[PDB]
């Protein structure tokens, strides 16, 4: 058009307003400069008001103090990037200064004292930026802390110095206290939050004063914790601020803490769908070797990198074939695309690996041009090291002058070059995104053009197998007559047999040479990236290697101890630290395969790091590790991940006690001693503390049935009373034995006999008779068949067959580990021999079968006070295969909504059923011992039933020297018995459902633990009785207030699961267990029911003094009393991580079978092969044997206050 382009820039560069907002507002001033600028000025406020319908949840916080008068305001923008922009900073910095000098408490005074200049930005920037709440504080000495820009505190204290307020301001910034001291609590807010939590308690049935006292305790904590006084000082968590302050001469007159965006909602954003649903208007209108290049769009909020990411996808759809990331294809390569709406939030994903980048695409609108905050974009690109940036000029159809385009280009090509990107040489396409949606080929080509650059400018990423060999070492074995071998997964490159390789990492790098390469299955001549292999070496002993070093092509990789990195430490929500750390953080760093411990130094100016924020730190390790920049690592804390990070630049590199661990060790190994039955004594004092008659004799401990009425509280104790001593293996009182166990075993056998006979002969001589049982196995059979298959797939038999666990026909519990199963020859049954031959034909390693008998060992395990438990130890090659079908049955039962790895969903339905009364829970007595053969073949495909006959142990060898041939099909201890009873039970139960018009979906099962709708129970009972099973009338509940399933026991919805004292208590470990189980059964969140607390306290006095006070949080084990760890005198807080000591079972090392452990290692690589976001950088660890002595040890472990 008429208006010249050369002079709209002179106005553009004196305003900052858009390009078309200049070109058009200049045709109105007839082409007069100061005219058009004054036109825009007032024609501006409308823009602003046009903005304030956008949610502005970002922005910065500022703080200034004068002698002892301070103030704090937060001014909001809507983007992370603006918050740190040249201009925006200068604004909030003036609206802060001006607010100091002229003290301004009222927020409107200044909001309007600036409102004119506030538009002098919204116009330039184009984001809703509104100066939000301000307030101020003054006292005798008042200090301020500034956590970057996202959180500021103002602290005033009449009685302290500088260092102190700093610190207490630091604590306030990282603890969010609502009140300055516990008493400040709104007398009303608390008179009702207590008169409301006094119901929570009282409806559960608890007596008045117990609910009162409990609620009060809960209330004292509830308050104390949210009040500065009752908050553990964050730089000395072993003492509260209450005390920190009073021990210091001081007291705080008050505090103020603002965090950016508090209270504001900001409805979540989702890039994936948002584009897919924006092009939903325009949608209505062998080559796997292709590299995966990911890119990211970065630009102004409404310059429409949103609308562009659409066009790209649709246009590349009409022209070609196929963590919130949209993807699209080019004839040559496949692209992943992500939005970059937030500096910090990107830096986080690029570190956490949840999204890296090969090239960015900078999206600006030619309508406006580079926004002032565009340099922050480019700068984000610079900092993250994004190799290439392509620029898409958007909305060009709205610029009738072509010299204005070449002007914008100029502007952006220069910014690009202030930040070291190739400005003169960087590709820039001019095209509209919206028109390319409207099927307008003229502007459609401009999109294909852009992807045309993604194709040629963003370079193809080096394929993993083209980089120099490297295999992270997971384990070393010394193989007799073959030499040393390391196992790992080859991270990159290739290692051909005969090549020379270095082992560099934790010691003086050593060199060696590849003598071979093998997987469990075949043996190979080369190791190819991505493969889980074993690499054979020569002339290197097996103690000259450690898990943690790499094997690599010589000179490829070097050992380093010092490096400056960028890390993101996890937030609380993501399961990380819930507490900040400081100058001397001393965690462990996980490098592909091992923790190596190290010290960090913060950068220039930071002094605190909070769960959730980013950080550049220089880590310096204790001993070296093979690395170069780009290498990811986890930050670890006693096995828990609390951070992640990457190496940025490799630098040239340069507590506990004696008579404390020993003092506790001595106590641990003491023997707590008392008169009589300590367990029984405790139980009786617990009954007494709850107004219940104690046990008269040991005889009654186990002969006491509960009442299923009374309130939930009157029942919880009644139930505990009936269970707590019921499994105690140490009552003398009784002609009771394990002979009782066998009599049961012989009885199940005899019964299986009957049903094997019954189940083969139903021809009622007439046609009349039709029976429920008959009809159910007929239906069950058909459903199983459809679920299971004609026969077990080999594809499934292969990924589920394995060694694992306990004793076998040939290994005693002590040689239980899988390594001693590949080590020693396992037995095997005639029918089963073909399976192991089939296995032997598939591996080069030698599969050895020891004796070849049809026998298993029927043995005996303690279980009750009144009975033992019969079990079966299998030929260990049988087991290997019984765990195979057992594993496929496990996958298949998932289609019936049965998930056998999760007894959680069975506990909840027990809980539901006790309020709802619609689900019943049924328990079966002998179960694993009652599945007869007859029942098995009637129900199973013949193909299945055979491979079940093969893998089963048909005969049994008793301890009595004698023999049995099994009438049942299998016993607990058989690798598939659990799933086969699960499936047998589910199908039966489901068929009864169908027979009754109920949902098969309502039957859910875990072993012999059945939940189904309560109306199906009396039919189930009759069906079970038919197929053999004997139903426990005493333990199936289809009607009362009570249910039980998988260890959780419920009454009307309240958890009433008891605890058990199973063993005579003789050691401090033993006592602590009981005391802890009492703790858990009686605490409602760290708060004691006072009826038990008395008994706890009494018996706690029985332990060695130091041990009464050595406490751990919950979920950390039973090697210490569960309680407060900030109270724990022994807890040594090392390098900002708190270590507490616990009783360990003392164990001696043993020699592992190098071969069998190495097979086990490789057989596992094989298995995994046929199967936050930081678990991808951890492994599964080496084989170490040990035998536990009866002595105890003390181990220090990492803790956190919750
Ligand atoms: Ca049960």
The tokens describing 984, both together, are: 């047998």
- Tell me how far apart the terminal alpha carbons of the chain are, to the nearest angstrom: 69
In CATH terms, are 288-463 and 558-651 the same topology?
no
**CA 299, CA 447: separation in Å to the nearest integer?**
17
| Three-state DSSP class for residue 521 | coil
CA dist list (Å): 842 to 462, 521, 821, 879 = 35, 6, 18, 18
Per the CB < 8 A criterion, the answer to whether 203 and 1052 are in contact is no
User: What is the resolution in angstroms?
Assistant: 2.8
Closest by alpha carbon to 370, among 85, 130, 119? 85
Strand-pair partners of 388: 359
The tokens describing 398, both together, are: 């709205």
**CA 1070, CA 1048: separation in Å to the nearest integer?**
23
Q: How far is the CA of 1008 from the centre of ligand 1 (A)?
A: 6
CA angle at residue 949 from 948 to 951, to 5 degrees? 65
Q: Widest CA span of the chain, in angstroms? A: 115
Going by DSSP bridges, is the β-strand pair 559-569/614-626 parallel, antiparallel, or unpaired?
antiparallel
Backbone φ and ψ for 731, nearest 5 degrees, come out as -80, 130
**Residue carrying the six token digits 């307030």:** 135
Per the CB < 8 A criterion, the answer to whether 952 and 877 are in contact is no
| Three-state DSSP class for residue 240 | strand
Q: How far is the CA of 41 from the centre of ligand 1 (A)?
A: 78
Burial (CB count <10 Å: 0-12, 13-18, 19+), residue 714: middle
339 a known binding residue? yes
Q: How far is the CA of 1058 from the centre of ligand 1 (A)?
A: 14
343 a known binding residue? yes
Going by DSSP bridges, is the β-strand pair 510-518/523-524 parallel, antiparallel, or unpaired?
antiparallel
Number of Cβ within 10 Å of residue 919's Cβ equals 23
Number of Cβ within 10 Å of residue 204's Cβ equals 17
Number of Cβ within 10 Å of residue 1126's Cβ equals 18
340 a known binding residue? yes
Per the CB < 8 A criterion, the answer to whether 361 and 416 are in contact is no
CATH fold, domain 558-651, is Elongation Factor Tu (Ef-tu); domain 3 (2.40.30)
CA torsion sign for 934, 939, 942, 944 is negative
Q: How far is the CA of 927 from the centre of ligand 1 (A)?
A: 11
**CA 177, CA 181: separation in Å to the nearest integer?**
9
341 a known binding residue? yes
Per the CB < 8 A criterion, the answer to whether 226 and 154 are in contact is no
| Three-state DSSP class for residue 648 | strand
DSSP state of 130: E
For residue 423, the Cα-to-chain-centroid distance in whole angstroms is 43
**Residue carrying the six token digits 């907002």:** 21
Catalytic residue among 124, 147, 305, 857: 305
Q: How far is the CA of 726 from the centre of ligand 1 (A)?
A: 16
The tokens describing 553, both together, are: 């092509």
User: Is residue 302 flagged as an active site residue?
Assistant: yes
Q: How far is the CA of 978 from the centre of ligand 1 (A)?
A: 13
Domains of the chain by residue range:
1-287+652-788+866-1142, 288-463, 464-557, 558-651, 789-865+1143-1202
Closest by alpha carbon to 1087, among 201, 170, 59? 201
**Residue carrying the six token digits 């006690």:** 657
Going by DSSP bridges, is the β-strand pair 428-430/388-394 parallel, antiparallel, or unpaired?
parallel
**Which residue pairs from 677-681 have beta carbons closer than 8 angstroms and sit at least 24 positions apart in sequence?**
677/730, 677/1064, 678/1064, 678/1065, 678/1071, 678/1102, 679/725, 679/728, 679/730, 679/1061, 679/1063, 679/1064, 679/1065, 679/1074, 680/725, 680/728
Residues with Cβ–ion distance below 5 A, ligand 1: 923, 1009
Let me know if domain 464-557 sits in CATH 3.40.50.10480: no
301 a known binding residue? yes
**CA 883, CA 1106: separation in Å to the nearest integer?**
47
b/e sequence 601-640, b meaning 16+ C-beta within 10 Å: ebeeeeebbbbbbbbbbbbbbeebbbbeeebbbbbbbbee
b/e sequence 983-1021, b meaning 16+ C-beta within 10 Å: bbbbbbbbbbbeeeebebebbbbbbbbbbbbbbbbebbb
> SS3 string of 346-411?
HHHHHHCCCCCCCEEEEEEECCCCCCCCHHHHHHHHHHHCCCEEEEEEECHHHCCCHHHHHHHHHH
**CA 796, CA 802: separation in Å to the nearest integer?**
12
DSSP state of 436: T
User: Is residue 343 flagged as an active site residue?
Assistant: yes
For residue 520, the Cα-to-chain-centroid distance in whole angstroms is 31
Experimental method: X-ray
Per the CB < 8 A criterion, the answer to whether 1086 and 1202 are in contact is no
Kindly give, in sequence order, each residue whose CB lies less than 8 Å from that of residue 289, ignoring residues fewer than 6 positions away.
none
| Three-state DSSP class for residue 530 | coil
Element (H, E) at 1142: strand 1137-1150
Burial (CB count <10 Å: 0-12, 13-18, 19+), residue 762: exposed
For residue 838, the Cα-to-chain-centroid distance in whole angstroms is 39
Number of Cβ within 10 Å of residue 1022's Cβ equals 15
Per the CB < 8 A criterion, the answer to whether 222 and 1092 are in contact is no
Element (H, E) at 1050: strand 1048-1051
397 a known binding residue? yes
CA dist list (Å): 802 to 58, 849, 928, 989 = 54, 15, 22, 31
Element (H, E) at 1118: none
Alpha helix (H) residue ranges in 500-658: none
Element (H, E) at 348: helix 343-351
Going by DSSP bridges, is the β-strand pair 559-569/640-651 parallel, antiparallel, or unpaired?
antiparallel
Per the CB < 8 A criterion, the answer to whether 610 and 582 are in contact is no
The tokens describing 654, both together, are: 């340069």
CATH superfamily ID and name for 288-463: P-loop containing nucleotide triphosphate hydrolases (3.40.50.300)
Q: What is the dihedral of CA 1074, 1075, 1077, 1078, to 10 degrees?
A: 120
Helices 5-15 and 33-42 pack at an angle, to 10 degrees, of 50
Backbone φ and ψ for 128, nearest 5 degrees, come out as -70, 105
The tokens describing 639, both together, are: 């096995």
Burial (CB count <10 Å: 0-12, 13-18, 19+), residue 432: buried
**CA 662, CA 679: separation in Å to the nearest integer?**
28
- List % helix, strand, coil for the chain (3-state, nearest 5): 35, 25, 40
Strand-pair partners of 517: 524, 535
1008 a known binding residue? yes
Element (H, E) at 528: strand 526-528
**CA 392, CA 415: separation in Å to the nearest integer?**
15
303 a known binding residue? yes
Strand-pair partners of 637: 640
Q: What is the dihedral of CA 212, 214, 218, 223, to 10 degrees?
A: 40
**Residue carrying the six token digits 């007859």:** 934
**CA 724, CA 745: separation in Å to the nearest integer?**
26
895 a known binding residue? no
CA dist list (Å): 809 to 812, 960, 977 = 8, 16, 17
**CA 602, CA 610: separation in Å to the nearest integer?**
13
Q: How far is the CA of 797 from the centre of ligand 1 (A)?
A: 30
Backbone φ and ψ for 228, nearest 5 degrees, come out as -35, -50
> SS3 string of 274-304?
HHHCCCCCCCCCCCCCCCEEEEEEEECCCCC
**CA 1153, CA 884: separation in Å to the nearest integer?**
24
Closest by alpha carbon to 541, among 478, 473, 475, 499? 478
Closest by alpha carbon to 481, among 931, 980, 1154? 1154
**CA 341, CA 55: separation in Å to the nearest integer?**
14
The tokens describing 1141, both together, are: 């000591």
> Edge-to-edge, what's the strand order for the sheet holding 1054-1055?
1042-1045, 1048-1051, 1054-1055
Catalytic residue among 64, 181, 343, 348: 343
Kindly give, in sequence order, each residue whose CB lies less than 8 Å from that of residue 237, ignoring residues fewer than 6 positions away.
579, 1126, 1133, 1138, 1201
578 a known binding residue? no
**CA 929, CA 914: separation in Å to the nearest integer?**
29
**CA 563, CA 237: separation in Å to the nearest integer?**
30
E-strand stretches of 139-207: 141-147, 151-157
b/e sequence 1096-1106, b meaning 16+ C-beta within 10 Å: beebbebbbeb
**CA 1047, CA 218: separation in Å to the nearest integer?**
28
Per the CB < 8 A criterion, the answer to whether 395 and 367 are in contact is yes
Catalytic residue among 15, 63, 240, 306: 306
CA dist list (Å): 910 to 162, 444, 716, 918, 1051 = 59, 60, 16, 10, 10
> SS3 string of 483-508?
EEEEEEECCECEEECCCEEEEECCCC
Catalytic residue among 93, 302, 440, 736: 302
Q: How far is the CA of 1116 from the centre of ligand 1 (A)?
A: 27
713 a known binding residue? no
**CA 368, CA 374: separation in Å to the nearest integer?**
11
Per the CB < 8 A criterion, the answer to whether 873 and 821 are in contact is no
Number of Cβ within 10 Å of residue 271's Cβ equals 20
How many residues make up the chain in this entry? 1202
CA dist list (Å): 749 to 659, 875, 1112 = 59, 21, 48
Q: How far is the CA of 1088 from the centre of ligand 1 (A)?
A: 30
**CA 382, CA 422: separation in Å to the nearest integer?**
12
CA angle at residue 618 from 613 to 623, to 5 degrees? 125
**CA 549, CA 507: separation in Å to the nearest integer?**
9
Q: How far is the CA of 724 from the centre of ligand 1 (A)?
A: 17
Backbone φ and ψ for 472, nearest 5 degrees, come out as -60, 125
Q: How far is the CA of 955 from the centre of ligand 1 (A)?
A: 28
CA dist list (Å): 892 to 785, 883, 889, 904, 1115 = 11, 14, 5, 19, 33
**CA 729, CA 708: separation in Å to the nearest integer?**
27
CA dist list (Å): 433 to 338, 362, 394, 515 = 17, 14, 6, 59
**CA 608, CA 596: separation in Å to the nearest integer?**
23
**CA 1156, CA 1165: separation in Å to the nearest integer?**
14
CA torsion sign for 846, 851, 856, 859 is negative
Q: How far is the CA of 1030 from the centre of ligand 1 (A)?
A: 14
395 a known binding residue? yes
Closest by alpha carbon to 719, among 1061, 1080, 1058, 1083? 1058
Kindly give, in sequence order, each residue whose CB lies less than 8 Å from that of residue 820, ignoring residues fewer than 6 positions away.
811, 1153, 1156
**Residue carrying the six token digits 């069975």:** 906
> Edge-to-edge, what's the strand order for the sheet holding 130-138?
58-66, 69-77, 130-138
**CA 1181, CA 1163: separation in Å to the nearest integer?**
14
Going by DSSP bridges, is the β-strand pair 1048-1051/334-339 parallel, antiparallel, or unpaired?
unpaired
**CA 722, CA 602: separation in Å to the nearest integer?**
58
DSSP state of 350: H
E-strand stretches of 69-194: 69-77, 130-138, 141-147, 151-157
Per the CB < 8 A criterion, the answer to whether 121 and 58 are in contact is no
**CA 1055, CA 1076: separation in Å to the nearest integer?**
17
**CA 347, CA 121: separation in Å to the nearest integer?**
27
CA torsion sign for 488, 492, 495, 500 is negative
């Amino acid at each position: 058009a008429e208006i010249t382009a050369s002079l709209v820039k002179e106005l553009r560069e004196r305003t900052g307003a858009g390009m078309m907002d200049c070109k058009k507002a200049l045709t109105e001033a007839n082409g007069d400069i100061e005219l058009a600028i004054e036109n825009m000025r007032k024609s501006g406020a409308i823009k602003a008001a046009k903005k304030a319908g956008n949610v502005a949840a970002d922005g910065v916080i500022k703080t200034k103090i004068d002698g002892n008068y301070g103030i704090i305001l937060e001014v909001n923008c809507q983007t992370d990037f603006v918050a740190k922009d040249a201009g925006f900073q200068a604004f909030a910095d003036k609206v802060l200064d001006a607010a100091v000098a002229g003290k301004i408490t009222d927020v409107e005074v200044l909001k309007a004292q600036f409102e004119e200049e506030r538009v002098a930005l919204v116009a330039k920037i184009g984001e809703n930026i509104n100066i939000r709440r301000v307030a101020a504080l003054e006292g005798d000495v008042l200090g301020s802390y500034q956590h970057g820009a996202r959180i500021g505190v103002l602290v005033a204290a009449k009685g302290a110095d500088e260092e102190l307020v700093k610190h207490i301001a630091m604590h306030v910034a990282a603890s969010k206290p609502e009140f300055i001291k516990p008493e400040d609590v709104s007398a009303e807010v608390v008179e009702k939050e207590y008169q409301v939590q006094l119901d929570i308690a009282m409806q559960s049935g608890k007596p008045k004063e117990i609910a009162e006292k409990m609620v009060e305790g809960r209330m004292k904590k509830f308050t104390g914790e949210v009040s500065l006084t009752g908050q553990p000082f964050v730089m000395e968590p072993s003492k509260t601020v209450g005390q920190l302050l009073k021990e210091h001469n001081a007291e705080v007159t008050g505090f103020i803490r603002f965090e950016v965006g508090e209270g504001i909602e900001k409805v979540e954003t989702d890039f994936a769908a948002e584009v897919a649903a924006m092009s939903k208007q325009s949608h209505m209108s062998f080559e796997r070797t292709k590299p995966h290049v990911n890119v990211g769009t970065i630009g102004h909020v409404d310059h429409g990198k949103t609308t562009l990411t659409a066009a790209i996808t649709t246009v590349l759809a009409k022209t070609y074939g196929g963590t919130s990331h949209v993807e699209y294809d080019t004839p040559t390569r496949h692209y992943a695309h992500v939005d970059c709406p937030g500096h910090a939030d990107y830096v986080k994903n690029m570190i956490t690996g949840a999204a890296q980048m090969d090239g960015a695409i900078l999206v600006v609108a030619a309508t406006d041009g580079p926004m002032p905050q565009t340099r922050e974009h480019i700068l984000l690109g610079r900092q993250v090291g994004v190799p290439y940036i392509i620029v898409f000029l958007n909305k060009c159809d709205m610029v009738d002058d072509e010299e204005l385009l070449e002007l914008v280009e100029m502007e952006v090509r220069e910014l690009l070059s202030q930040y070291d990107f190739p400005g003169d040489d960087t590709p820039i396409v001019r095209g509209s995104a919206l028109k390319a949606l409207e099927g307008d080929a003229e502007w459609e080509a401009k999109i294909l053009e852009l992807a045309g650059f993604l194709d040629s400018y963003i370079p193809e990423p080096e394929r993993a197998i083209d980089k120099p060999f490297l295999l992270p070492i997971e384990d070393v074995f010394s193989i007799s007559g073959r030499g040393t071998v390391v196992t790992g997964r080859v991270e990159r490159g290739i290692i051909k047999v005969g090549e020379e390789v270095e082992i560099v990492g934790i010691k003086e790098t050593q060199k060696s040479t590849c003598t071979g390469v093998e997987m469990f299955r075949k043996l190979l001549d080369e190791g190819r990236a991505g493969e889980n292999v074993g690499v054979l070496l020569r002339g290197i002993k097996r103690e000259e290697i450690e898990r943690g070093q790499v094997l690599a092509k010589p000179g490829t990789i070097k050992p380093h101890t010092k490096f400056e990195s960028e890390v993101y430490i996890l937030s609380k929500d993501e399961g990380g630290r819930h507490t900040p750390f400081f100058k001397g953080y001393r965690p462990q760093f996980y490098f592909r395969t091992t923790d190596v411990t190290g010290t960090i130094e913060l950068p220039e100016g930071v002094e605190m790091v909070m769960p959730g924020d980013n950080i550049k730190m220089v880590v310096t390790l204790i001993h070296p590790i093979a690395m170069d920049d780009g290498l990811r690592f986890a930050i670890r804390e006693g096995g828990r991940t609390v951070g992640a990070g990457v190496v940025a630049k490799v630098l040239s590199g340069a507590s506990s006690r004696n008579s404390l661990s020993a003092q506790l060790r001595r106590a641990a190994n003491t023997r707590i001693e008392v008169e009589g039955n300590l367990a029984l004594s405790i139980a009786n004092d617990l009954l007494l503390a709850y107004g219940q008659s104690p046990f008269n004799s040991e005889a009654e401990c186990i002969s006491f049935s509960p009442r299923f009425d009374g309130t939930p509280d009157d029942f919880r104790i009644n139930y505990l009373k009936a269970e707590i001593m019921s499994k105690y293996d140490d009552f003398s009182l009784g002609i009771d034995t394990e002979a009782v166990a066998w009599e049961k075993f012989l009885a199940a056998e005899a019964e299986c006999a009957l049903t094997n006979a019954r189940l083969y002969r139903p021809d009622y001589s007439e046609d009349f008779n039709f029976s429920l049982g008959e009809s159910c196995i007929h239906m069950a059979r058909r459903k199983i068949a459809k679920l299971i298959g004609d026969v077990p797939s080999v594809e499934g038999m292969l990924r589920h067959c394995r060694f694992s666990g306990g004793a076998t026909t040939t290994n005693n519990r002590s040689y239980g580990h899988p390594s001693f199963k590949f080590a020693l020859p396992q037995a095997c049954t005639p029918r089963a021999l073909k399976y192991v031959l089939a296995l032997r034909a598939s591996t080069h390693f030698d599969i050895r079968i020891s004796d070849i008998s049809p026998f298993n060992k029927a043995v005996t395990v303690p279980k009750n006070s009144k009975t033992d438990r019969c079990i079966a130890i299998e030929p260990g090659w049988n087991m290997f295969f019984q765990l195979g079908i057992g594993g496929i049955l496990r996958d298949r039962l998932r289609c019936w909504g049965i998930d056998l790895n999760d007894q959680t969903i069975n506990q909840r339905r027990a809980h539901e059923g006790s309020v709802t009364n619609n689900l019943a829970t049924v328990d079966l007595s002998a179960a694993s011992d009652s599945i007869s053969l007859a029942l098995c073949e009637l129900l199973l495909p013949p193909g299945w039933f055979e491979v079940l006959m093969d893998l089963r142990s048909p005969k049994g060898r008793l301890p009595d020297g004698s023999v049995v041939t099994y009438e049942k099909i299998s016993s607990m201890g058989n690798g598939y018995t659990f799933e086969l009873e699960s499936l047998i039970f589910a199908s039966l139960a489901r068929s009864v459902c169908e027979i009754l018009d109920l949902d098969s979906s309502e039957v859910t099962v875990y072993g012999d633990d059945i939940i189904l709708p309560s109306c199906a129970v009396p039919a189930l009972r009759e069906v079970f009785k038919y197929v053999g099973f004997t139903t426990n009338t005493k333990k199936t509940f289809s009607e009362g207030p009570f249910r039980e399933s998988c260890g959780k026991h419920y009454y009307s919805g309240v958890d009433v699961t008891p605890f058990y004292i199973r063993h005579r208590i003789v050691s401090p470990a033993d006592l602590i267990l009981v005391l802890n189980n009492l703790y858990r059964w009686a605490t409602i969140d760290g708060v004691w029911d006072p009826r038990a607390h008395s008994v706890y306290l009494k018996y706690r006095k029985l332990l060695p003094k130091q041990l009464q006070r050595n406490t751990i949080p919950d979920g950390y084990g039973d090697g210490a009393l569960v309680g407060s760890v900030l109270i724990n005198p022994f807890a040594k807080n090392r390098g900002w991580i708190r270590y507490v000591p616990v009783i360990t079972d003392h164990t001696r090392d043993r020699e592992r079978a190098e071969l069998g452990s190495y097979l086990y290692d490789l057989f596992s690589r094989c298995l995994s092969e046929s199967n936050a976001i930081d678990q991808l950088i951890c492994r599964s660890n080496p084989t170490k044997i040990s035998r536990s002595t009866g002595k105890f040890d003390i181990q220090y472990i990492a803790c956190s206050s919750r």
